[PDB]
Amino acid sequence: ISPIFQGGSYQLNNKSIDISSLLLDKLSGESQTVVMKFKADKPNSLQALFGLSNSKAGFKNNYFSIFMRDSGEIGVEIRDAQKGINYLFSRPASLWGKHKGQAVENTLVFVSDSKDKTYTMYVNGIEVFSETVDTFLPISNINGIDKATLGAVNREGKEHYLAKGSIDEISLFNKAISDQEVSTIPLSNPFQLIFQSGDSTQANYFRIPTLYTLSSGRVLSSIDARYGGTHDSKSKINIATSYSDDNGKTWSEPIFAMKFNDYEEQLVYWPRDNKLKNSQISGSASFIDSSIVEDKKSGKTILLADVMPAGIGNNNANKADSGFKEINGHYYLKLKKNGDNDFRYTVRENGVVYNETTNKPTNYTINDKYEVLEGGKSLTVEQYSVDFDSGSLRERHNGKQVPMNVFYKDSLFKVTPTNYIAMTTSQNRGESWEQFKLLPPFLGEKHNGTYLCPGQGLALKSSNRLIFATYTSGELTYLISDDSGQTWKKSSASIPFKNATAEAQMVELRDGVIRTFFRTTTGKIAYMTSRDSGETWSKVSYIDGIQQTSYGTQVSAIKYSQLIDGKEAVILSTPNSRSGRKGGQLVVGLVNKEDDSIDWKYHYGIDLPSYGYAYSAITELPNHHIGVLFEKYDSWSRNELHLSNVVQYIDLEINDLT
């Protein structure tokens, strides 16, 4: 239908614009839709874009507003003191500020639906909240409304929440427009989604993006598909992948690289309230933190990720056990049978389950999918599903049988509850993935596994060497393969931090010379250098000119193929903030050929200093553009948990950065 009111080109310069005479007499009925196209690249801390209020003395709390914060949060207030109603609905990290030196036109759609008693907000084609209430308050039914305002709310005759920005277009409808109609509204998005709520993964949340450009020109991406909100393991998380054959313009429907089936793939809206937001799926196995590399010789794509048994995460993982038993310089996966209090079994040659106590083979075997067979017959367990129907998180059997896996809660034979690393490969550049296999332990029988550094592995340009960085307490542990990932050895590099999440990414500065950039506990990104293809490593130095928080954030890094200002270039991606995960930047460093030192010469701001930017992936696209897939929110903040569609993709050119 046609709008009851439509206006545009409104400049909000800390001075409200009164549109009462244009709009108030046109409002009718209990349902309304507001469509607003707006810019704000220099917002005040808290500002109202649109207001309907009772501006009379004594009615200060009778108003409707659409507001935003300089954090990028968007929301509404719907308040009527006589009715005793004070609704506040909002979501952090819903907005764009600037892209390539230009203010971004955000397209906001707010639907106030009396029939279903629901208020729904979309921004840039993404639903950011949908709130159903017992007692509906139509925005036009607030007692004594006498003002309609842009760029403030008029309360007791004064301008509150003054805004800096512009409203290019605003439209109001006396109808709650349908989900279908919303989808038809044109958008001006600076970003794309590769993974998103409702896609083939059926995860409502995603974290830990990766990107890697393959030799064919295909660009591949992996990610954590996180089902139980955005929580780290313990949870249900799978690793998903998608690729682009057109320089990032379009992306394939995701598939899984690594997945477990003990719990259903459920699209769930995770509670964001203070009582329930820490609810965590507690009985599911999961994968977490993937990394990809391409092997030139075999042409294989290799993907590693951490593997967590049912109910296990970093916090509760057995720190003094690898999960393997060494027997004659060979490692065997240990198993515990239900009823036993110790691990009396190992998985020997050909998947045979062997009793270590009696030194006899059993009638059980483990297949290549880590599934349990008895006398050759596949055992099953019942799958779990999760719900909040009862007011709290419940995990319960759903009637479906799935193969019994040694990583599952219900399995007859269980692995040691600690963290592992697994590897899978693809022989068709991400169209399908093989069954994963566990890597061996690298730091001995009685040390838990190291943690994979998410992002890219490194394929040395002048040899067949492949390297994946990992970390543990007190060191980076580089995993090195010269045979297409068939066998691995470690190279340890001590770092002067205990208990750091030392996520590290590598660039080959020149043949045989690797620089590794990594997260620390000091507020500065660190680096170390190898001049022998990763055999040995320098002491740790720090990058001046970029700030991180004390807890740090993953940093991505590539070696750019083209000269910049006549020099070899490295590009880093990281938040640049001592305060939070925000102020995302790409930082261009020029290498000095004399001493391999790097002049960090250009800093490109991804969006506002105050807008969220966390884990990130960068790659040089085949056309020499840069693709960036990143968490556009503060993935540390306890206020920004469980947001959907915030991992986003953009395309940049070197000219944009410099």
Swiss-Prot record:
Binding site for substrate: 207, 519, 581
Enzyme class: hydrolase
EC number: 3.2.1.18
Pfam families reported for this sequence: BNR, BNR_2, Sialidase
InterPro entries in the cross-refs: BNR_rpt, ConA-like_dom_sf, Glyco_hydro_33_N, Sialidase, Sialidase_fam, Sialidase_sf, Trans_sialidase_dom3
GO molecular function: exo-alpha-sialidase activity
Catalytic activity reported: Hydrolysis of alpha-(2->3)-, alpha-(2->6)-, alpha-(2->8)- glycosidic linkages of terminal sialic acid residues in oligosaccharides, glycoproteins, glycolipids, colominic acid and synthetic substrates
SUPFAM superfamilies, per the entry: Concanavalin A-like lectins/glucanases, Sialidases
Catalytic center residues: 232, 503, 615
Native organism taxonomy: Bacteria, Bacillati, Bacillota, Bacilli, Lactobacillales
Similarity-based family: Belongs to the glycosyl hydrolase 33 family.
CDD domains, alphabetized: Sialidase_non-viral
GO biological process: ganglioside catabolic process; oligosaccharide catabolic process
Domain of life: Bacteria
Gene Ontology terms: cellular component: cytoplasm; intracellular membrane-bounded organelle; membrane
Name by which UniProt lists this protein: Sialidase B
Originating organism: Streptococcus pneumoniae serotype 4 (strain ATCC BAA-334 / TIGR4)
Keywords: Glycosidase, Hydrolase, Repeat, Signal
BNR repeat spans: 242-253, 424-435, 479-490, 528-539
Classification via PANTHER family: EXO-ALPHA-SIALIDASE (PTHR10628:SF30), SIALIDASE (PTHR10628)
